[PDB]
Design a protein around this ligand. Structure first.
Ligand SMILES: CCC(=O)n1c(=O)n(CCOc2cc(Cl)ccc2Oc2cc(Cl)cc(C#N)c2)c2ccccc21
Ligand SMILES: [Mg+2]
Ligand SMILES: [Mg+2]
Lengths: 409, 548
């Protein structure tokens, strides 16, 4: 709380200038309440028009009648990557996925002590908007490490790693990863004592001055979920077709596949609804390719130079299925998601995205860029309503339908 | 005049420096008229003579139509830092809050009334010529926000904002909206105290240097503001004059589509689909364009709508917000926003198809989006929606649609026309219905093709096609199997294109072919459509891919 680490943008990069989304009068009001207080506690200050930069700003409800502010530093983050990835990069423990339990702790109130480089604050500017453009927004910049910027944890990393040194000494079977404003704590304890070892930590942290929120992921379940060829009692031509098609598509992922014997087992222009039966030479390709679906793929290795790409697909019945990858047909991870007259499609998507993003952080220490199946403007309107996370992935909007659907179910 | 307001610091863009554009000599009459203004601007402190030490210079010219002074800051604007963008958007009258009375105050010399940073005054240096004569010019600098400088609108607005903060605290029963050089004061006081408050404010302003007009010179309703007539209990667009012409150029159709769009906020029913299609070519502005038949009609119907005048009403927070959507037929929708059943807040249209194939359920959904975004911008909330669609029509569609959507709280309305799913493909195949195995192919280079089928009942056909494409035939193939089929039919296709197009269940399309497939699909009472890999000898497509 005295020395301000210097921050440089990557040379020939000006700061962010991103349009503020318009907000419901409800949500504005909260941000005024919240900022008026932040400004008294000195964490932010009003700014003049000699500051052109701006970063968007939302209001979410955390877990909680209490409104919280969420700032979208995606742009600034891109333009500071030199600083929070190379200069003071926090390295990623590639084992947290192994542990049988992982708890996530919000530590981002840590940062509001640390003052922010005097010269860098201009780039944190945000705007509280007004309605109908009655008057120009209220303009602040940050005086302290702001939650949501990737520099913030990168700076604090020393103070964090010191404070953590006692606890890592006492119990060195535990792993602790810091992604932005979250500590991911994994352990192989049975659940009962994991949850107390998490209380320990909590109160360890809390008595060195780090308050924390007063959510257990078992990566012992994560695995590429394989393609399922529904065997039934009956069979038809149609089903032989649906069957043939699935398998032909799969040939791009598992070249080791064949169906000629399938494709000859209906060689006659027949009605679709013909209950055709099972053959020997044909049946030889069902089981023979049915277990190849149990065998994993070959040569699928996470390139850390490349972005992760997540695709989700609505599957009906509150079901959603996702695949993460970097090169087509080379799927690193794949999963499914489901809700429990309480849920709506968006809420579901928003939850799914959150879930896929955490998995992502645990595994690779980087978030994926989402191909969201929704209409840009609908998302840009309702995503903050079920958003609980302190961070925000990149996303885009697939307006091209899938057709595959079940193919990935 | 120059004020005791605090200055904003200003910098030039990094690794740049001040302009040095020399000045073309002007008429000895002009050079006269420049000095008359300069010194009377100097007396008033706005500018200060300087020694040639200052190396900077910016062109000056002069003009009239009382002579006037213009400066070419363009060169300076290029090297000055960027500032916080000013209000790009303007408040929509429909969302202005209803107030007992409304005062409009324009400030004068607004920019000249505000001081400019001292260390950034040098770069504003100009010079007045001495009718050549090898006579040294008059070197002057600004000490206030220069006109047409990049920094002026933003710094002025800061300054105005801050100058108001005290008053606004001591009088929060009143509301001041800010716009460029104006101030729009609205109150719910009695006419005698408001006039008092106004005249009070005017004095606060004057003590900070900002001049403002008398009760005698205050603009009086109705107010011609940003292409709107603002009345004290009603707003509308200004008068609109669509021209009648014999020939229509691109520039003309644009200005027309503009005006028509402008009108759409308060004049219901306005359509612009067919008119805007003309512009599709997006070619030269002076190119003449023939009017289509449908376009001529649309302009006619529009003309009738603007034949009489209609007005919008202001916003009341203590009243609910409502939105109603009415279909119009050509992928054209229209809506009205109201709190009370005959007094509309505003109106508009949604017509974007967003693709060459759509269905009304989708489109209506997209329409609600548009309305929600605007509602939120204008009134900071979203409206209760009154929609011509059955809760059962919608749930069916979205449950079965591949994208995700959010249908805000909404109640039915019966006002026909109503939104419907005209057909629905079967989810499972049909036992005891003929199975057609359609395929169709075309040679790119020959630009000729053929669609056909084959059935389980041994029925076969091939129609020949000229001037088409693979895609065009893939659909004709289906079009055929519908034509030659009973009221229940199984079609089996190798083209994901054609499948894609149909699975979407469009009810309206740019392609006539698809509109006709839509026709046939409506008659049939059961259609099942099924995909199989082409050139994979699935059994039956093989036979139909062979007759091609
Ligand atoms: C019973 C109603 C009544 O007397 N008037 C009324 O309600 N309006 C609409 C509300 O307008 C304003 C509200 C506020 Cl808080 C502030 C200013 C307003 O006016 C503006 C706004 C704008 Cl952006 C530009 C201009 C110009 N030029 C004026 C009226 C508008 C005019 C006259 C009377 C009323
Ligand atoms: Mg004006
Ligand atoms: Mg349509």
């Amino acid at each position: 709380p005295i020395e301000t680490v210097p921050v440089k943008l990557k040379p020939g990069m000006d700061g962010p200038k991103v349009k503020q989304w318009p907000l419901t009068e409800e949500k504005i009001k909260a941000l005024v309440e919240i900022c008026t207080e932040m400004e008294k506690e000195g964490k932010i200050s009003k700014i003049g028009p000699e500051n052109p930069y701006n970063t968007p700003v939302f209001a979410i409800k955390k877990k909680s009648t209490k409104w919280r502010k969420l700032v979208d530093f995606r742009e600034l983050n891109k333009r500071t990557q030199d600083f929070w990835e190379v200069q003071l990069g926090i390295p990623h423990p590639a084992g947290l996925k192994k542990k049988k339990s992982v708890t996530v702790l919000d530590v981002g109130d840590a940062y509001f002590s640390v003052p922010l480089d005097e010269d860098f604050r201009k780039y944190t500017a945000f705007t509280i908007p007004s309605i109908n453009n009655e008057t120009p927004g209220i303009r602040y910049q940050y005086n302290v490490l702001p939650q949501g910027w990737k520099g913030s944890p990168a700076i604090f990393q020393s103070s964090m790693t010191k404070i953590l040194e006692p606890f890592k000494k006492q119990n060195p079977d535990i792993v602790i990863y810091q992604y932005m404003d979250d500590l991911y704590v994994g352990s192989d304890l049975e659940i009962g004592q994991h949850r107390t070892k998490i209380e320990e930590l909590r109160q360890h942290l809390l008595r060195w001055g780090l308050t924390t929120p007063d959510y257990e992921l078992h990566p012992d379940k994560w695995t590429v979920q394989p393609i399922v060829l529904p065997e039934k009692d009956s069979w038809t031509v149609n089903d032989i077709q649906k069957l043939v098609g699935k398998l032909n598509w799969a040939s791009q992922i598992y070249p080791g596949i064949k169906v000629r014997q399938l494709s000859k087992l209906l060689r006659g222009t027949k009605a679709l609804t013909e209950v055709i039966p099972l053959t020997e030479e044909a049946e030889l390709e069902l089981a023979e390719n049915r277990e190849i679906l149990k065998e994993p793929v070959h040569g699928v290795y996470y390139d850390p130079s490349k972005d992760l790409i997540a695709e989700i697909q609505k599957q009906g019945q509150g079901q959603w299925t996702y695949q993460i990858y970097q090169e087509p047909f080379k799927n690193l991870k794949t999963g499914k998601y489901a809700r429990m007259a309480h849920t709506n499609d968006v809420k579901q998507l928003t939850e799914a995205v959150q879930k896929i993003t955490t998995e992502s952080i645990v595994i690779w220490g980087k978030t994926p860029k989402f191909k969201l199946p929704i209409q840009k403007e609908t998302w840009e309107t309702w995503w903050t309503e079920y958003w609980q996370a302190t961070w925000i992935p990149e996303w885009e909007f697939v307006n091209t339908p899938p057709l595959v659907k079940l193919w990935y179910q | 005049p120059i004020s005791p307001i605090e200055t904003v610091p200003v910098k030039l863009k990094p690794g740049m420096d001040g302009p040095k554009v020399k000045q073309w000599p002007l008429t000895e009459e002009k050079i006269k008229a420049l000095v008359e203004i300069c010194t009377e601007m100097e007396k008033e402190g706005k500018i200060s003579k300087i020694g040639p030490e200052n190396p900077y210079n910016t062109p000056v010219f002069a003009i009239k139509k009382k002579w006037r002074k213009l400066v070419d800051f363009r060169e300076l604007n290029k090297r000055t830092q960027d500032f916080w963008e000013v209000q790009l958007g303007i408040p929509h009258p429909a969302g202005l809050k209803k107030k007992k009375s409304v005062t409009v105050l324009d400030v004068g010399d607004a920019y000249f009334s505000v001081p400019l940073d001292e260390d950034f005054r040098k770069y504003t240096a100009f010079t007045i010529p001495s009718i050549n004569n090898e006579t040294p010019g008059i070197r002057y600098q600004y000490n206030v926000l220069p006109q047409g400088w990049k920094g002026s609108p933003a710094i002025f607005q800061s300054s105005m904002t801050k100058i108001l903060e005290p008053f606004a605290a001591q009088n929060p029963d009143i509301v001041i909206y800010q716009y460029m050089d104006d101030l729009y004061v609205g109150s719910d006081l009695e006419i005698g105290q408001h006039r008092t408050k106004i005249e009070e404010l005017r004095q606060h302003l004057l003590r900070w240097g900002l001049t403002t007009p008398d009760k005698k010179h205050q603009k009086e309703p109705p107010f011609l503001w940003m292409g709107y007539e603002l009345h004290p209990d009603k707003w509308t667009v200004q008068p609109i004059v669509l021209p009648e012409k014999d020939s229509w150029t691109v520039n003309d159709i644009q200005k027309l589509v503009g005006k028509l769009n402008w009108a759409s906020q308060i004049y219901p029913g306005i359509k612009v689909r067919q008119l805007s299609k003309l512009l599709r070519g997006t070619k030269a502005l002076t190119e003449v364009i023939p009017l289509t038949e449908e376009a001529e009609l649309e302009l006619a119907e529009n003309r009738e709508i603007l034949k009489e005048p209609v007005h919008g009403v202001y916003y009341d927070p203590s009243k609910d917000l409502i939105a109603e959507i009415q279909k119009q037929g050509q992928g054209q929708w229209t809506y009205q926003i109201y709190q009370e059943p005959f007094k509309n807040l505003k109106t508009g249209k949604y017509a974007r198809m967003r693709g060459a194939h759509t269905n009304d359920v989708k489109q209506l959904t997209e329409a609600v989006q548009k309305i929600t975004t605007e509602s939120i911008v204008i009134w900071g909330k979203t409206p209760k929606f009154k929609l011509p669609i059955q809760k059962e029509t919608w749930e069916t569609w979205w449950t079965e649609y591949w994208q995700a959507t959010w249908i805000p709280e909404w109640e039915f309305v019966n006002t026909p026309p109503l939104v419907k799913l005209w057909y629905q493909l079967e989810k499972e195949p049909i036992v005891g219905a003929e199975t057609f195995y359609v395929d169709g192919a075309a040679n790119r280079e020959t630009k000729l093709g053929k669609a056909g089928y084959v059935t389980n009942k041994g029925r076969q056909k091939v129609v020949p096609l000229t001037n088409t494409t693979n895609q065009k035939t893939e659909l004709q193939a289906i079009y055929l199997a519908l034509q030659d089929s009973g009221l229940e039919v199984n079609i089996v296709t190798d083209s994901q294109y054609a499948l894609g197009i149909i699975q979407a269940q469009p009810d309206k399309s740019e392609s006539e072919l698809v509109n006709q497939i839509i026709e046939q699909l409506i008659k049939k009472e059961k259609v099942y459509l099924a995909w199989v890999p082409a050139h994979k000898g699935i059994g039956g497509n093989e036979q139909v891919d062979k007759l091609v």
